[PDB]
Design a protein around this ligand. Structure first.
Ligand SMILES: [Mg+2]
Ligand SMILES: [Mg+2]
Ligand SMILES: [Mg+2]
Ligand SMILES: [Mg+2]
Ligand SMILES: [Mg+2]
Ligand SMILES: [Mg+2]
Ligand SMILES: [Mg+2]
Ligand SMILES: [Mg+2]
Ligand SMILES: [Mg+2]
Ligand SMILES: [Mg+2]
Ligand SMILES: [Mg+2]
Ligand SMILES: [Mg+2]
Ligand SMILES: [Mg+2]
Ligand SMILES: [Mg+2]
Ligand SMILES: [Zn+2]
Lengths: 121, 217, 81, 97, 25, 206, 96, 129, 87
RNA sequence: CGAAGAUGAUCAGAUACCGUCGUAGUCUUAACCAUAAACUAUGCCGACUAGGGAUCGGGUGGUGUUUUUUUAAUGACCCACUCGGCACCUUACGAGAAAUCAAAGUCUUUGGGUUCUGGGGGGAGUAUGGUCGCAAGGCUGAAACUUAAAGGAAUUGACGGA
């Protein structure tokens, strides 16, 4: 049974939340820099914290991790989320408008391309 | 000072609101007792009742203490706070906090002739909590507060001089009696009398006016 | 709806009511000039006509009474009022 | 206090329904209360379908079925784990599952 | 006692009370 | 009040009628009956899109009246509107809450997600029922995107729209962002369209 | 309409109903039947003189453990026998 | 069956004034109802009202502004001396300054202040505040 | 209210609901006040100038506040063809 | 089938539950009785107040499906209303001590009309008187005396051959 407690997990989240341009996918250097950037009171606890931090870094490598929110994730979100389709949807492929839909169009009085096609019911 | 959360608090400790009737008028929720402690500094607290409530356990009874606290000044404002705690001093202190947060105004009035400085309430009012119903009737001058002593202290701390009280249900349930009386004196501005029929131009909220003296950045 | 005009409702909302539950109650029945194909003489016949109404030429039935509106006898011509 | 609104039964506009007898203990119980299950079973069993097919003239015959409507009293359905006492909020649920 | 059998025991007592009076009457 | 350029345009009509914001539900509640225009056969009612546009412009007038924009919170717990609330967030000021609302965000000042808005816009009053119910505690008006069967309790400005369609949700958020920018100097003209396209408010698979 | 009749000419029904229901109180029943002058050994009186017959020791009800030191008394005006408590420490030595 | 139509009128008015509606439909519209509503209207508690004339008993639509707390009928119509008007006003009215006890008097249907000025008295119909 | 010697004594006239004219009192935290921006020529929003409504917690809890705001805005001119008196 | 009763087991006992029989009874005719947790533990009449969907009976309208085959009755079905019914679901505007309740709401802001019932628990539905019944019993119905609680709803715990 190797389930890790919240003192390990919360420490690892609070290490990746502020030392991401630091610690990498290697346990040995992560273990070394936990001694500088944190005051972990025992070597075994330091080793658990460093290994779970490394396990989390290997997960941020392939997709993001929910609950982990650092400021190199936000640009990685925003650059991917700036995408817009080039087909430019909600344009006119050739506007298929039903009967009561066209009555709505006419009662507005607006210029609409039309194709009145009855509803099979 | 606390340099707080809550935009209304950042207005109140900055001094953009210096009067509790602005908060009452705009119905702003007061979630910090220091707002009430600054806008109403002369607020007097009184411990109505401390009683033990008990919980049955696997072995033993766990006892906690329920404190009922009335805070108020004799110029038209009271609050009521019920807090349970493991110790009575903590129950009384957090009851003072909750009672300060629950401060409401009362509409005082005349039994009737409008010779100055209202002594009574403006309307018959009722309040219900549990089985208890408390009815306050306006009374002439020098009648006093004709009420049982807990309700009498709540109306004295609200600054009513002149009131009759009817009651119904188990008034020995003290928290229900005080909560029904507190509902009753909250209904005083709830009633629409003909002198409030005039439609008013609906003033702009201080959270819209001093919107940058709020919103710490 | 909390604000509505009870004095002038829509004709749809008054056709969609019971005959007694309208703003002023009145009948939904009517009368029919009915001409049987024998002669040209015309009998006025109630909508909900409760009675096997006979003309003088077609002296069997013009309408058949049912639970609501009467059923006209399949060759007669009907005009309203 | 009142446990259920349709008190334990299904009677809105009768007064009296009729009694049935429970199929396990013979108790008289009104038909709207009783507890009613259907037993649609194959005539033999799951295992002997191959035995009865290999011992069959008229190959792929029918495999006929038994259809039995069983009526239970409340005590016998609870003891036979047909209805299984529910929580106070979850006993309002009326769906077959 | 269940109140049904309390009522039943009361009926047994009542019959004896109106038989011991019909003895004297 | 609105002079001439706030009326419905054929371009916006093409947008709404293409993205099917006019296709309402099959069951209409009594508080959303006025937005119904002449129910189409095979069940589905037709929403008055001129009335949709008028309520959308009124909602944008409410949004462009809060002085600070960062306490005009946009809510969507449904995955269709989750892109659109972040886009409305980027384009106006608009603190976003996408995904889980975390009850105790308008009350409970010691939460990390504690916000004090002045106006809350939600995508569905069914799915975002917690945000509406908690805006009912701290005096916050609610702009909601509503279908004909969406609930109307503590909803102050119902913008009628097909909540079942991702194009409809994204376009409605798009027009709301566009008109809040038209009522300031970000989008200086009322007529020439916004080069930020409708299509980057639409949720994407896969 | 709250069960009781409200109409202007229903004072007969209201007063007869109040007279009938008044009988369910303890004090009105006891005062109107004359219970104090038929029952109640002190036949309406506040005090009554009597002759001591016997000194009794009554064992008190649970959870109290004591002997209560009463007297059996035949009332002079009435002939009824009553039991009377002798209240104080001692004072049963004072009776006779 | 129906026994007071003023009771149904005032009950419907109260049930929609509680729920915040601005119009009631009242059936079946007696002239006592009309003269009650005229006193309410001249004291400001209700707006315009309109008598729909069907050929049976009339209907009324009443505009309700926001001002009415309670209108009730005191049934039965008790006989009121001129000295015990003050008991009815103390019992039904929420304050001594506002509110009206509506009396029917041979001088007319009128509120208690008007009846005190005219020094008349009669039977009590209801109240409004 | 006012006393005999002038001196308006209230402490404070409460806001009344723009749909129903009920008093909006201090403990009623479901009530809102909605400011609509006033729009000048060429469609700006005039920072500072509002058409203000107040809706009570009663109508907002009852679900009538949207139609009430439709009626109020159409009466003050903010909306044109959304609300019909004849329902 | 089965009060009673036989009879076989069980059990410390078992004059009970279980098993086998089995009279009255269960059915009916002609009369009596007049009670039930006769319950929706919710009198009857009337009005108003919030949303929905299903269903039963009647009615109204589709130039709707089932007889799609040339300008294709009716019944049956579908859609939309409508009145009346048995109910249900959501909410709590409201009510309540709560459970819960569209009535158990429109109640201290207390009056739509009307009938019946109750006044702490026992003693006691007893005694007595009257009256009805063949009877069993029913209907009406106390008091002396006694008592500080009995009760209702919900909570936590503990316990259960759940
Ligand atoms: Mg039980
Ligand atoms: Mg029965
Ligand atoms: Mg009379
Ligand atoms: Mg024998
Ligand atoms: Mg009985
Ligand atoms: Mg029952
Ligand atoms: Mg009964
Ligand atoms: Mg009856
Ligand atoms: Mg048909
Ligand atoms: Mg009330
Ligand atoms: Mg008593
Ligand atoms: Mg008693
Ligand atoms: Mg007898
Ligand atoms: Mg209990
Ligand atoms: Zn003829």
């Amino acid at each position: 049974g190797r389930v890790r407690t919240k003192t390990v997990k919360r420490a690892s989240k609070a290490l990746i939340e502020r030392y991401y341009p630091k610690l990498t996918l290697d346990f040995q250097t992560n273990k070394r820099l936990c001694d500088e950037i944190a005051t972990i009171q025992s070597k075994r606890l330091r080793n658990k914290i460093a290994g779970y931090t490394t396990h989390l870094m290997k997960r941020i490598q392939k997709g993001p991790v929910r609950g982990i929110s650092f400021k190199l994730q936000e640009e990685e979100r925003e650059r991917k989320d700036q995408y817009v389709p080039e087909v430019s949807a909600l344009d006119l492929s050739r506007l298929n408008v039903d009967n009561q839909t066209s009555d709505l169009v006419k009662s507005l009085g607006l210029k609409l391309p039309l194709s009145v096609i009855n509803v099979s019911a | 000072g606390w340099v707080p959360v809550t935009k209304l608090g950042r207005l109140v400790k900055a001094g953009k609101i210096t009067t509790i009737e602005e908060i009452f008028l705009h119905s702003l929720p007061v979630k910090e007792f220091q707002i009430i402690d600054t806008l109403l500094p002369g607020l007097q607290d009184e411990v109505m009742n401390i009683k033990p409530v008990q919980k049955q356990t696997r072995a033993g009874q766990r006892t906690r203490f329920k404190a009922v606290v009335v805070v108020g000044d004799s110029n038209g404002h009271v609050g009521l706070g019920i807090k349970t705690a493991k110790e009575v001093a903590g129950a009384i202190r957090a009851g003072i906090i909750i009672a300060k947060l629950s401060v409401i105004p009362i509409r005082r009035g005349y039994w009737g002739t409008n010779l100055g400085q209202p002594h009574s309430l403006a309307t018959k009012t009722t309040g219900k909590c549990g089985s208890v119903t408390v009815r306050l009737i306006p009374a002439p001058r020098g009648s006093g507060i004709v009420a049982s002593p807990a309700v009498k202290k709540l109306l004295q701390l609200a600054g009513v001089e002149d009131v009759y009280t009817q009651s119904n249900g188990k008034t020995r349930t003290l928290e229900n009696t005080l909560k029904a009386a507190f509902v009753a004196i909250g209904n005083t501005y709830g009633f629409l009398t003909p002198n409030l029929w005039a439609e008013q131009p609906l003033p702009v909220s201080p959270l819209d006016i001093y919107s940058d003296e709020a919103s710490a950045q | 709806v909390l604000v509505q005009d009870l004095l002038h409702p829509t004709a749809a909302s008054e056709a969609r009511k019971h005959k007694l539950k309208t703003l002023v109650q009145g009948p939904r029945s009517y009368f029919l000039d009915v001409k049987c194909p024998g002669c040209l003489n015309i009998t006025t016949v109630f909508s909900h006509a409760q009675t096997a109404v006979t003309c003088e030429s077609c002296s069997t039935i013009l309408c058949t009474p049912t639970g609501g509106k009467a059923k006209l006898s399949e060759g007669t011509s009907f005009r309203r009022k | 206090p009142k446990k259920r609104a349709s008190n334990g039964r299904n009677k809105k506009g009768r007064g009296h329904v009729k009694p049935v007898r429970c199929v396990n203990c013979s108790k008289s119980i009104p038909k709207d209360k009783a507890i009613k299950r259907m037993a649609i079973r194959n005539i033999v069993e799951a295992a002997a379908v191959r035995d009865l097919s290999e011992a069959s003239v008229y190959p792929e015959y029918a495999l006929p079925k038994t259809y039995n409507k069983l009526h239970y009293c409340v005590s016998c359905a609870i003891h036979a784990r047909i209805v299984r006492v529910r929580s106070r909020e979850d006993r309002k649920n009326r769906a077959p599952p | 006692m269940r109140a049904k059998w309390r009522k039943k025991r009361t009926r047994r007592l009542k019959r004896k009370r109106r038989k011991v009076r019909a003895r004297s009457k | 009040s609105l002079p001439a350029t706030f009326d419905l345009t054929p371009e916006d009509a093409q947008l709404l009628l293409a993205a099917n914001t006019h296709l309402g539900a099959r069951n209409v509640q009594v508080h959303q009956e006025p937005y119904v225009f002449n129910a189409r056969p095979d069940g589905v009612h037709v929403i008055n899109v001129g009335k949709t546009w008028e309520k959308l412009v009124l909602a944008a007038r409410i949004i462009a009246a809060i002085p600070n924009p960062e306490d005009v919170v946009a809510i969507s717990s449904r995955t269709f509107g989750q892109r659109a609330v972040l886009k409305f967030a980027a384009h106006t000021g608009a603190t976003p809450i996408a995904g889980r609302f975390t009850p105790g965000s308008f009350t409970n000042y010691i939460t990390r997600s504690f916000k004090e808005p002045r106006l809350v816009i939600v995508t569905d009053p069914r799915s975002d029922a917690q945000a509406i119910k908690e805006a009912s505690y701290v005096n916050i008006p609610v702009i909601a995107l509503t279908d004909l069967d969406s609930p109307s309790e503590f909803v102050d400005v119902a913008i009628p729209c097909n909540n079942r369609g991702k194009h409809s949700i994204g376009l409605i958020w798009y027009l709301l962002a566009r008109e809040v920018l038209r009522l300031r100097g970000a989008l200086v003209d009322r007529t020439q369209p916004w080069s930020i396209m409708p299509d980057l408010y639409f949720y994407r698979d896969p | 309409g709250k069960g009781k009749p409200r109409g202007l000419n229903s004072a007969r029904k209201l007063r007869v109903h109040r007279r009938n229901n008044r009988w369910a109180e303890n004090n009105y029943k006891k005062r109107l039947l004359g219970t104090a002058f038929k029952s109640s050994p002190f036949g309406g009186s506040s005090h009554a003189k009597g002759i001591v017959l016997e000194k009794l020791g009554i064992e008190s009800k649970q959870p109290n453990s004591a002997i209560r030191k009463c007297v059996r008394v035949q009332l002079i005006k009435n002939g009824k026998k009553v039991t009377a408590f002798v209240p104080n420490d001692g004072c049963l030595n004072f009776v006779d | 069956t129906r026994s007071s139509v003023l009771a149904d009128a005032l009950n419907a008015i109260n049930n929609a004034e509680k729920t915040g509606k601005r119009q009631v439909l009242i059936r079946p519209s007696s002239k006592v109802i009309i003269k009650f509503l005229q006193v309410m209207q001249k004291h400001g508690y209700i707006g315009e009202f309109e008598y729909i004339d069907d050929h049976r008993s009339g209907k009324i639509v009443v505009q309700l502004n926001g001002r009415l707390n309670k209108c009730g009928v005191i049934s039965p119509r008790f006989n009121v001396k001129i000295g015990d008007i003050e008991k009815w006003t103390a019992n039904l009215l929420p304050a001594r300054q506002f509110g009206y006890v509506i009396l029917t008097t041979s001088a007319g249907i009128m509120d208690h202040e008007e009846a005190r000025r005219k020094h008349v008295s009669g039977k009590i119909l209801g109240f409004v505040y | 209210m006012e006393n005999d010697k002038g001196q308006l004594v209230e402490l404070y006239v409460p806001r009344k609901c723009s749909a129903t004219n009920r008093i909006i009192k201090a403990d009623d935290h479901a009530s809102v006040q909605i400011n609509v921006a006033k729009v000048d020529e060429e469609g700006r929003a005039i920072p500072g100038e509002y058409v203000t409504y107040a809706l009570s917690g009663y109508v907002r809890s009852r679900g009538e506040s949207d139609d009430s705001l439709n009626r109020l805005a159409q009466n003050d001119g903010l909306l044109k063809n959304v609300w019909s008196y004849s329902r």
